[PDB]
Amino acid sequence: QQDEYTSAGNVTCWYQTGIVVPAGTPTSCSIMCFVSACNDFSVRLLKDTPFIEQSALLQ
Amino acid sequence: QQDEYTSAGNVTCWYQTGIVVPAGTPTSCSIMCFVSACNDFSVRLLKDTPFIEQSALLQ
Amino acid sequence: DRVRSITLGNSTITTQESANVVVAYGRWPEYLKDNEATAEDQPTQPDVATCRFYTLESVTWERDSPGWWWKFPDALKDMGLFGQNMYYHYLGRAGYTIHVQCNASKFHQGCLMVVCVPEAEMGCSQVDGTVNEHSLSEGETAKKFASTSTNGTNTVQSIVTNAGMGVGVGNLTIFPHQWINLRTNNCATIVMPYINNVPMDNMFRHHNFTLMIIPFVPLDYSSDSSTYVPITVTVAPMCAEYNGLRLATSL
Amino acid sequence: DRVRSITLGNSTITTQESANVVVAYGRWPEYLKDNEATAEDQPTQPDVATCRFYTLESVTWERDSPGWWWKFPDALKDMGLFGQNMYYHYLGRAGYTIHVQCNASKFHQGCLMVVCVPEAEMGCSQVDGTVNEHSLSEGETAKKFASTSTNGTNTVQSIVTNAGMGVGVGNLTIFPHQWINLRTNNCATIVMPYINNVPMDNMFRHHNFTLMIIPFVPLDYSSDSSTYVPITVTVAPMCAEYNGLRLATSL
Amino acid sequence: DRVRSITLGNSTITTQESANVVVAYGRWPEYLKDNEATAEDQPTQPDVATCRFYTLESVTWERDSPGWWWKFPDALKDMGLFGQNMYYHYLGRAGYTIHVQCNASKFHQGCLMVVCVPEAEMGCSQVDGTVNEHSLSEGETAKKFASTSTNGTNTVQSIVTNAGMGVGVGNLTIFPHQWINLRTNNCATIVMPYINNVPMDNMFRHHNFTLMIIPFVPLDYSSDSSTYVPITVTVAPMCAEYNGLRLATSL
């Protein structure tokens, strides 16, 4: 639950040259992004998650 | 300063088959040519060059 | 693996999209040996003035093109000193390196067969008739296969399906050959040794082999791709020998 | 053989279509040694805060584009801690790695020359005049070569054929250079050592080298291919040293 | 490195644009051992009549296609002798090799995810309801994911973003998977071992795994490029075993 004291920064992307295509090709393209953790990664202090909830039993 | 006695010949280029392109490509293309000397090359008899000249001092 | 360089005499060919090289029957050209010779005079061997690449004139591959053929020798009788050595001697002997070039873009399509046929004897369009040499060959200019059955006198029966020899054209793969598939490669190369039933022969009287170029898949392209696609042949003699020097013949 | 990776500091560049790397005269950058120094105070060497890739702003390659140039240093004087170390010292020294990127499709065409010229002294469009520094450089923004002879006062004579130096533009291959041929590669890389007649120098007063990007074959394309094709430069200093610490200068 | 050949039984697959092969969890299929068996009768092992590639029917990838799924087994219950051995026994066991093919030109674009999900239990579009087996599977014909929330009775809730399981579709990479990126490769291959909580099981009652094909980047093309682009699946069982022979069941 990050606050201003433990902030980590930002990521940005820019055109270094631009996209060049020949005739007969679609002009627009798309990029996809994947995330994962490295081999020095770890966590601690177990807690309950805020993503699941119920209003009564039998759910 | 080559004369008819020390002539060296000529160079020519021709289509061996022709240029073939698919649809969606520019038809015209261009070729470039570079010149250099081999490892058996040499010169002699120093002289002044005819490419630089002046009409008065301070030039 | 696709790049190749061939040097002969003062000529060199480079290529960047070659398949391989066909050596006709596993035999490279070579000179005549002593236990196989019959002519007794000392032969001449020019060795760089004759053994080099000569380029013929090009043809235009169109959307409906049946194919082309040349006859060897007699396509090199006006080529430098090879032709001059042909005119002054009675007997000659040589192998060959053939190189066919045709390039196109990745948006074109088509497939050519390049084949060398030894002793390709041809028939006349009139069955009660005989052929003449003008209908067989035009030197460095190519003869053209036809699209249907031919008629009239003195022309060769040249519908492509029979290859002008009374055979099926799909069986010509029995001879030394390669393919030019426009999506794969852009050149073919065949190395042919001397093939005959006698050790030497007269080069004006006898055609040793015919070169055939036949498209199986026609040329196709789309909206604004290049329309002009040429094909070019280049031939180099190898281990050339001559015997029987006299005054120059006249055709 | 075409894939390359370069790491400096906290920055990395990958490429999948590179030709090779040019090392200017066979010499890699290095620090100043003891038997070649003249300044006596201990120098500072930041070593990861200054030696890393900085990216400039991009230009648009159009169908009729004459070319562009930058001056180094003075194009990196507002770049992080390299610029701050430039402002507080009297003497500096560094080599560089330059990387130019421009990608396009297999249906485009064009050819660029990327060249680094040491001590590129330029002339004014008025022959009875002198140049000023605004006409020589705009920092991270590029100056533009022209299409014809230039006129008016205070501008540099910038017709591309003379490269603004009174030479033939086709001879610039005497300097360290590479080519970007759109059908072959999409990036150029040059490693430049420190080149001067003195071991250190002031970085605001002296331009050590000019970077020129000149298209020899213009950009061309067809019906509905992409029209926007940008070019991007990225530069990293190497073995950076500073001497003579005082208060910060002001331009 | 991109060419591959796979032989099983009397069938062979060649490919010239493959990425690699995924082995589900580092485990290859194998037969059941003696210290893990519970059923006592001698099992049958046909070994070439069942372990071979069977091809299903193809689907058409259109510009707005949500995706497709199949259930295994029950997609091979009418395939040769594998299906016949399924109908006469009570217990069966097998691993699989899956191969998905989709080719296109260098002027097309698109990206597909190919994933195998063990025990893919699905939900009904009515939340106070239960599913039936016709809505889960149609044998060799594919079920189709949807574009929005589904309604009506007896159909599966099939909006692609939730994958019909109540999860995020971008996390399905936790399972064995590959990608088909039209500019990179044209086929995917996954080798799946037997995965269950019991050593054998009945093949009509239990779906062991679901195969999902989901496009993340839709298919796009320009003026006169080909519009019809099909996708094809081919599956081969491996180390197939059966137990409990009786009369043939009837569905």
Q: Which residue has the tokens 């499709």?
A: D105
Tracing tokens 């260098």 back to the chain, one arrives at E106
* Secondary structure of residue C244 in the 3-state scheme: strand
**Tokens 């022709």 correspond to what residue?**
B18
Helix (H) / strand (E) element for D97: namely strand D89-101
Which chains pack against E, by 3+ Cβ pairs within 8 A? A, C, D
Identify which of B17, B22, B25 has the shortest CB distance to residue C102.
B17
- Name the phi and psi angles at C87, rounded to 5: -85, -20
In angstroms, how far is the first alpha carbon of chain E from the final one?
Answer: 46
Find which of E108, E109, E177 to mutate to test the A interface (most A CBs within 10 Å of its CB): E109
Among D240, D197, D235, D205, smallest CA distance to D70 is for D235
Looking at residue D216, the DSSP 8-state letter turns out to be E
CA–CA gap between residue C232 and residue C210 (Å, rounded)? 16
Residues of A in contact with B29 (CB under 8 A): none
Nearest-Cα distance to chain E for A46, in Å, is 23
> D221: nearest CA in chain C?
C224
CB-nearest to C229 from B18, B23, B25 is: B18
Q: How would you classify residue D65: left for phi > 0, otherwise alpha for psi between -120 and 50, otherwise beta? A: beta
Chain E residues whose CB is inside 8 A of the A26 CB are 109, 220-222
Residue E156 burial (CB count, 10 A): 18
Q: How far apart are the first and last CA of chain B?
A: 28
Q: Supply the DSSP symbol for D146.
A: B
Write the CB contacts of E168 (distance below 8 Å, at least 6 apart in sequence). Answer: E161, E162
User: What pairing do the DSSP bridges indicate for beta strands C177-181 and C68-72?
Assistant: unpaired
Residue among B24, B28, B29 whose CB faces D107 most closely: B24
Token pair of E11, please?
A: 């069938």
How far is residue E83 from each of residues D1, E87, E238, E250, measured CA to CA in Å? Answer: 50, 6, 14, 12
∠ CA E151-E155-E161 to the nearest 5 degrees? 70
Residues in chain C within 8 Å Cβ distance of E106: 106
* Phi/psi of residue C113, nearest 5 degrees: -105, 130
* E187 backbone dihedrals φ, ψ, rounded to 5°: -160, 150
Note whether C107 contacts B18, CB cutoff 8 Å. Answer: no
Phi, psi of E244 (to 5 degrees): 85, 60
The span from the CA of D73 to the CA of D206, in Å, is 8
List CB contacts (< 8 A) between A32 and chain E.
Answer: 111, 216-217
C150-175 CB burial, b ≥16 within 10 A, e <16? beeeebbbbbbeebbeeeebeebeeb
Final resolution, Å: 2.3
Those residues of chain D whose CB sits closer than 8 Å to some CB in chain E are 106, 223-224
User: C34 pairs with which residues across the strands?
Assistant: none
Can you tell me the distance from the alpha carbon of D9 to that of C243, in angstroms, rounded to the nearest whole number?
77
Nearest to C224 among B14, B17, B23 (CB): B23
Residue D111 CA to residue D215 CA, distance in Å, equals: 6
**Chain C residues touching D223 at Cβ < 8 A:** 223-224
Distance CA E214, CA E113 (A): 5
Residues B23, C221: C-beta atoms closer than 8 Å: yes
Q: Is A24 on the interface with D (CB under 8 A)?
A: yes
Antiparallel, parallel or unpaired: β E143-144 and E4-8: unpaired
What DSSP assignment string belongs to B25-49?
A: S-S-----------TT---------
Q: Which of D143, D144, D96, D149 is nearest to D118 (CA)?
A: D96
Of the partner residues D216, D217, D222, the one whose CB lies closest to the CB of residue B25: D222
CA of E184, closest CA in chain D: separation in Å?
13
CB < 8 Å to D224, chain E: 222-223
How many angstroms separate the CA atoms of E52 and E10, rounded? 7
Q: Which residues of B touch A26 (CB under 8 A)?
A: none
String of DSSP letters for chain E:
---EEEEETTEEEEESSB---EETTS----PPPGGG----SPPB--SSSSSS-EE---EE--TT---EEEEESSSSTTSHHHHHHHHHEEEEEEEEEEEEE----TT-EEEEEEEEEET----BSSSSS---HHHH-BTTBPEE-BSS---SSS-B--BGGGTTTTS-GGGGGGSSEEEEETTT-SEEEEEE----SSS-B-TTT---EEEEEEEEEEEE--TTS----EEEEEEEEEEEEEEEE-SPP--
How many residues belong to chain C? 251
Q: How far apart are the first and last CA of chain D?
A: 46
Cβ of A5 under 8 Å from any chain D Cβ? Answer: no
Q: Does B19 touch chain C (CB under 8 A)?
A: yes
H or E element that contains C135: helix C133-136
Residues C118/C124/C130/C136 CA torsion (nearest 10 deg):
-50
Cβ-in-10-Å burial (0-12, 13-18, 19+) of C123 comes to middle
**What single-letter DSSP state applies at residue C231?**
E
Whether B29 and chain D come into contact, CB under 8 Å, resolves to: yes
Q: What is the largest CA-CA distance in chain D?
A: 65
CB atoms D230 and A27 under 8 Å? no
Tell me how close the Cα of E19 comes to any Cα of chain C, in angstroms. 21
Chains sharing 3 or more CB pairs under 8 A with chain B: A, C, D
Q: How far is D108 from chain E (nearest CA, A)?
A: 13
Closest approach of A24 to chain B, Cα-based (Å):
6
Chains in touch with C (3+ beta-carbon pairs under 8 Å) read B, D, E
Q: Is the peptide bond before E218 cis (omega within 30 degrees of 0)?
A: no
Q: Which sign does the torsion angle of CA E175, E180, E184, E186 carry?
A: positive
The method of structure determination was: cryo-EM
- Phi/psi at A53 (5° precision): -165, 160
* Residues D64 and D221: beta-carbon distance below 8 Å: no
β-strand pairing of D22-23 with D187-192: parallel
E177-213 residues labelled b (16+ CB within 10 A) or e (exposed)? bbbbebeebbbbbbbbbbeeeeebbebeeebbbbbbb
Distance (Å) from the alpha carbon of E222 to chain A's nearest alpha carbon: 6
Token duo for residue C86 = 């042909």
HEC readout, E165-182: CCCCHHHHHHCCEEEEEC
Indicate which of C63, C105, C109, C112 best probes the interface with B, i.e. most B CBs within 10 Å of its own CB: C105
Contacts with E224 from chain C: Cβ below 8 Å: 222-223
Smallest Cα–Cα separation from C118: which of C190, C29, C208? C208
Determine whether the interchain pair B17/C231 forms a contact, defined as Cβ–Cβ distance below 8 Å: yes
Question: Which residues, 6 or more positions from D34, have their beta carbon under 8 angstroms from its beta carbon?
Answer: none
Nearest to E109 among A29, A32, A34 (CB): A29
Any CB–CB contact under 8 A between B24 and chain C? yes
CB contacts < 8 A, C to E, total 4
Contacts of E206 (CB under 8 A, 6+ apart): none
d(CA A6, nearest CA chain E) in Å? 27
Pick C107's closest partner by Cβ from B14, B17, B24.
B24
Is A26's Cβ below 8 Å from some Cβ in B?
no
Strands D89-101 and D187-192: antiparallel
Q: Which of D226, D227, D231, D235 to mutate to test the interface with A (most CBs of A within 10 A)?
A: D226
The beta strands (E) that lie in C167-229 are given as 177-181, 187-192, 209-220
Nearest residue of chain B to residue D223 (CA atoms): B24
Nearest Cα of chain E lies from the Cα of C122 at a distance, in angstroms, of 43
CA distance C251 to C242: 19
Shortest Cα–Cα distance, E67 to chain D (Å): 30
Structure tokens at C193: 């040794």
Rounded to the nearest angstrom, the minimum Cα separation between E107 and chain A is: 6
The residues that bridge with D13 in the sheet, in sequence order, are D6
Q: Which of B24, B32, B34 sits opposite D222 (nearest CB)?
A: B24
Specify the pairing of strand E187-192 against strand E89-101: antiparallel
Residues in chain A followed by a break, C to N above 2.5 angstroms: none
Q: Please, are residues E68 and E143 in contact by the beta-carbon 8 Å criterion?
A: yes
Give the C-alpha separation, C192 to C23, whole Å: 7
| Chain D touched by B9 (CB under 8 Å) | no
Q: How far is A11 from chain D (nearest CA, A)?
A: 14
How far is Cα E16 from Cα C177, in angstroms, rounded to an integer? 25
Contact residues for C159 (Cβ-Cβ < 8 A; gap 6+): C145, C146, C147, C148, C149, C150
E106 contacts in D (CB within 8 Å)? 106
Name which of D222, D229, D234 is nearest A23 (Cβ-Cβ).
Answer: D222
Cβ distance B24 to D225 less than 8 Å, yes or no, reads: yes
Nearest chain B residue to C186 by CA: give it. Answer: B17
Question: Could you tell me which of E231, E4, E214, E222 has the C-alpha nearest to residue E106?
Answer: E222
CB within 8 A of C205, min separation 6: which ones? Answer: none
